[model samples]
Target chain A: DIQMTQSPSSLSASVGDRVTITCRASSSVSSSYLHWYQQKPGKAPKLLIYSTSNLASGVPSRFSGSRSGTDFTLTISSLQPEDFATYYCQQYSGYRTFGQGTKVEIKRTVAAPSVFIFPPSDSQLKSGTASVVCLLNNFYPREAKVQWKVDNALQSGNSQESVTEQDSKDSTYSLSSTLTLSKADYEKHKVYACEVTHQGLSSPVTKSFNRGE
Target chain B: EVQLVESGGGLVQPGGSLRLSCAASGYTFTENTVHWVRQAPGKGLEWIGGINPYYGGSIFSPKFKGRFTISADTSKNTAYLQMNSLRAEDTAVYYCARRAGAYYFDYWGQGTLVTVSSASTKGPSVFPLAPSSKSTSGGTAALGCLVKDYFPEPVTVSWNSGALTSGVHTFPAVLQSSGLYSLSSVVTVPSSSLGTQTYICNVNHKPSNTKVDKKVEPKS
Candidate 1:
């Protein structure tokens, strides 16, 4: 039996975006032997393409298929909301075989926060005390975890954190945390780090501040 | 809601024959075609055949052309699959689906499992252990033997009169398309002992109440 290998096991796309899924056969097969189907959760698969490039009855025109040698592709010109489902390619050349499947998921629109640490004011330093401010800017969906690290160690108790919604169309948010300590302690620590953890960022965002620079 | 229920699935001896039926309801049987698909254990799906009840037209996969017969009866609102000359590889779960068009299967029946096994028991035919490589003076030498054409398994293979346990491995028995099982076992021993020691493979087939021993010696 000719095996079908599909590519891009899963992808993220939004409505109106175009996407293409590919299938390659283990051996050369006639274009007429290729077919494609769409399957939704809890529902039977529905035929989308048959005989290589011919569309099934009543399928949307945006869904199209083509074959080049042993490679076959199924492309959607413009994705609809309902098009976020798994697609499978099947071959009827020998004994029938199906591709593993490609899942098209909805792309989550999220912006990662920008991290910055503001140096302590000269007036506070002159009073033999220092106050450092860590700011997280322009992050969407709002929620984030902010922490202060003094010389790489977590600092607790004397820190204040707050969030403010930015006045914009995207409704982004900003968060700030203030850490106060003695000027001698600040100089002794040498580095104060601001770490922001959010869903949009693959890893936590950290910004460091030095006493002299 | 269209419904397709399949039946007539069970154990069959190799070379035996059987007929499976797919009963359809909640829709007009003659209005659509019914297709048969099967999935082997741990393997992918295979299209078997299909039949149209109204015109009595049928088509089958090229692999099953001669051994499979597909038919439909509108009066009973059911389709049938007649399989002949069965083999161990033919064991699978078979399903019946309602074809929407030339290629789409809109609704499917719960699958029925069919298993092929041997009804008559047979003793194992043991073969002499063949050395895999020429043994170096101080290195190890490996030898293996073939145990085939056995039935109602649970066969045991022991090396060196059951005195050797380590450096020995036995593979799981595989059911051949001929409806019999076959297995292989290998043992590794010191090359220096190969020239002076006699290695024996003891195959115990409990079903046939038989024990076969095949021995090998170093070439002079």
Candidate 2:
């Protein structure tokens, strides 16, 4: 199978700004073998163009696709408010392959997140285990890394995290993380910390949970 | 509120033909279109084709143009995928999805598995085992591959075109209740190499003279 590479992994643009995303196949692809899709956060991908330049049914005319040998382009003549999402290109000449997505973000000032860690709830504790919750709110670009620590030492395991656009009220995103540990370990540890790293922040944010507080 | 239920999945001999069915409810079938998508075991999704029941219009992927057919019956509110001249590579899970607009599939049926196999060969079907959870810790990732449902016991498993020999672990084959055999192999590599490397699992079945290569791409 051929590999597809997308350019300008991420771009920022305002409403009505013209945007173009390029996808290049490792090898030559037939003109009609390429397709494009738009994907909003937490939603299924929507087809925007198919067979190179043909717009899919009901897709706005502002969106168009074109192919030049191995390079294919998906252009937005006038970006809409809802068009600020991830876009991917796929080729079907042989087996199917998709390019890494290109995220179209809104051009705006970055918003640093407010990180908060909640102490484990006694009612939710079970099987001699307790859970700690971390909430990061009002972040822009929706890209952040989270880590949990016990007694200043990094804790490693599966950390459950979920992100929400938060009603799209301010184009900011919120994320929550949960860490579960043994009840005995939580009591023995000096503190539990939730650390977040984001491009918007000059330094990482850390919030700690102390016993009973 | 739309619902799609797909059926008609079973083992089919190579060169045989099969018709899979997808029943639709909670919507008027003629007013909407249905598309067929398939995914080989441990592989990405592939769009097969779609049919608009009202007008009898249809579109298909060029790769599946000749051997695959997509159609619908308005009265039964069902869509069908008729595949002919099947091969082992065609073994996959077939899904019937409702086309929300021109190209996107919204409501999809639980996929039906179609296995293409031959009784004469008795060679194991091999596939890379998808990670149950992607937890890459300590900078190492474990990759696994499964070879199952074969007889006569002797098989060979290799990794990365035989370049990886040290970390590879091939387990003994276990006989199944059905008299077939199953086994698995695992290899650990640096986690950072995931997005830049491709791992291939090669299986050779001696009795059937069958060689199968199943790959796990980094991006997947």
Candidate 3:
């Protein structure tokens, strides 16, 4: 009575395609305790469905859950943005077991974001104030993390982010973020770094800049 | 708004006894269930046992059934996990969580690491044999994960699908015999789901507090 299983370990679908994942229990567990969770890369698993079929608060309407006997189904009528990831079903009956997750991957080829760091320009470096800009180019599912550090300490300075820009030719995305600092602050820190973090990379890409270069 | 804090000895000897404690605060101590969860270094979480502070009732996972005791002191707002006949595999980081609503942990205690290194530090070998899957009549397919010859102690087997139905096997080790240990865990998936099916098997060897993941891809 402690088994939970899921089928179709993975699926390939378009954004508008209809998709469904199933979960089955070895026996009838508490209907009120069945839950479904969605996990995106590099993020915590979030609750999407709870109490058998009721959508957890804040989940999109396109996602719905239903249950019959020992079988449970989670359906996405028309997949939309942010719907691609692995889903898991958890049952609390008989020693708590979770179904093996089912992954829903976009069928087409989606490019990863190409990242770049722009060192302070010559004019700005001498102007007493400048910003280091990071450009994330040609990526799908626009998500990125940019961090600024000075002398091994976290920096709390003004930052600017551009809305996701779409590539005219390929429907991909490019995102830009900038961190502003005064020449005095940059020169005093000695070691300034801009780190770019995204799910596409195994480690954070840090661009280190030293003064007088 | 309950808070759980886990405290315990950092080291224990093989064949010795160990006790771990979880202190609760910020809420009614005897009003909820307190659960003990363990994480071997580099391994996934394991449900050890739990106690209902209000009723003084306790339950243990099959793997921890014997020689493991769970008790609580409602007056002190604390729950205790005691293990006798400690082995090298008993070493792990243990946490306590206050069960809130319907099996969810709204508050969890920081984990405390415990090490048991008296017997041997040599860990078990974990490797996966490519899964063999077949369509079953129930509109699902059966998949099997085969982990061969491990040593010292029987390993705990878990899958991405939470706890396996059969749970862990504890075939006591024989130091002189080459018999080692062998385990096979089976899971069922929907036939329609087999095309893209991929699952992970996590084998936890307690002696070294090492956990390894083995990916099982059924042959097409």
Candidate 4:
């Protein structure tokens, strides 16, 4: 029996939370035909992977994809409240197989005060400070990646990003990244991209944010 | 390991009764399974189902319902398919394939050609003496020839002969998103030319991937 494996069977996100999904095919099947799909409830499944990593026509800009040695991923760059849903991966032929799915749901476990941040995009400045308040109405152990940058270079330092301070709402961990930006050392119209990677064999998923004035 | 060795060719007169054979090789005929499959040029594959000679279990793809029958000879490790009411459209190459369930067709027979022509003392009335005539949406057409069998998944569909039109007539309009193409184009044969015009749903997939050249002829 051919096998298709998946992880993080379920997930919960607030108004804006990045989600990611992964899939692995049992064999090479590298004959240039793998696909990812997004399905929520009763709607027709939409194509998110075609010939590996290339987005299909009419797809949203926030969706991006990638693959490696039968291992593939789908990431939602920025999370929108409407982005809560399930995603799956499929092989073009060779038994016509499909992987298990991952579901993105809304949170029911939180009350809250709020912190929200949307970043800026510049073609010139490579690095800058960017943050998105991991909403209080969230939880931990979530599969999310957060990082910082400076003058267009990815920044990694011994700096504190978030603190789990409790108020009158629910409890959840927060993730933030702060870095430096320079226009004189970089080009103009550069971007400070805060990408939220979703789940699946596709990437740079829906709802992306860029720092702005 | 199971195997399928098939019968090669059959002789026929213009419109005579027909029954072809595909013998079994390698695995036990009663133990392993066998099925028939069809392929059209630029089209995805369509399954025709299988037969288990052991217990006589069988299933078929909805598209192929009733058009064919499945039976087996357990002692020979071979399965058979008999399709009645033959036509020139059915003259394409056919194969005996080894497959089970929704799994991909792992193995395929070399293929067999089953042609039915009337063996009469008169003139050669059944021969394709004239080029096949047809009128497509854009007055463009593609005629494919029959093909032998091959293995693996996502069967290849190609034209043997006939000028294939591009652009508006994108060959295999359905394979754009899937290897198992769910044919999406709608076909029509108007009442005015119902009897005079022959419109066969040509499936352009492997084995029988070719279609005949159809010259676009308007109503007289």
Best lDDT among the predictions, by candidate number: 1
In order of the candidates, what TM-score does chain B achieve?
A: 0.55, 0.57, 0.53, 0.46
Q: Name model 3 segments beyond 4 Å from true.
A: A8-19, A37-48, A56-63, A76-88, A100-213, B2-26, B38-46, B84-95, B100-220
lDDT of 1 by residue, B1-220 (tens): 7789988776678999989999999998899988898867655456888888999989887889999999988999999999999999998878887876445566778677687776766897765444433555666665555576777565778887889876555655666656777666666677777767778988987656779887855432
lDDT accuracy of residue B95 in candidate 2: 80
- What is the lDDT for B41 in model 1? 64
Instruction: State candidate 4's TM-score.
Output: 0.29
Give per-residue lDDT, candidate 3, residue B52. Answer: 91
lDDT of 2 by residue, B99-135 (tens): 6543345566877768787754478876554322234
Clashing pairs in 3: A8-B193, A100-B161
Error of 3 at B15 (Å): 5.7
- Model 4, A1-213: lDDT tens per residue? 244576667676664566777778786766356666665432334556566677766777677777777777777777664555567675644334556677766553432222222232221123332222211113343344544333345546422233322111332333332222344432343444433332321453222223332
Show how many residue pairs clash in every candidate, following the order shown. 0, 0, 2, 62
- TM-score ranking from best candidate downward: 2, 3, 1, 4
Give candidate 2's error at residue A200 in angstroms: 4.7
lDDT of residue B185 for candidate 4: 15
Which candidate do you rate higher for DockQ, 3 or 4?
3
Question: What are the per-residue Cα lDDT tens digits for candidate 1 across A17-80?
Answer: 8899999999987777688878654234567898789898789999999988788999998977
Q: Kindly give the stretch of ten consecutive residues in candidate 1 chain A with the minimal lDDT sum.
A: A164-173
Residue B6 in model 4: lDDT: 62
**Model 2 Cα lDDT, one tens digit per residue, A98-127:** 777788876545889766555544433444
The DockQ ranking, best first, is 1, 3, 2, 4
State interface RMSD in Å for all models: 26.6, 15.2, 20.8, 24.6
- Ranked by TM-score, the better of candidates 1 and 2 is 2
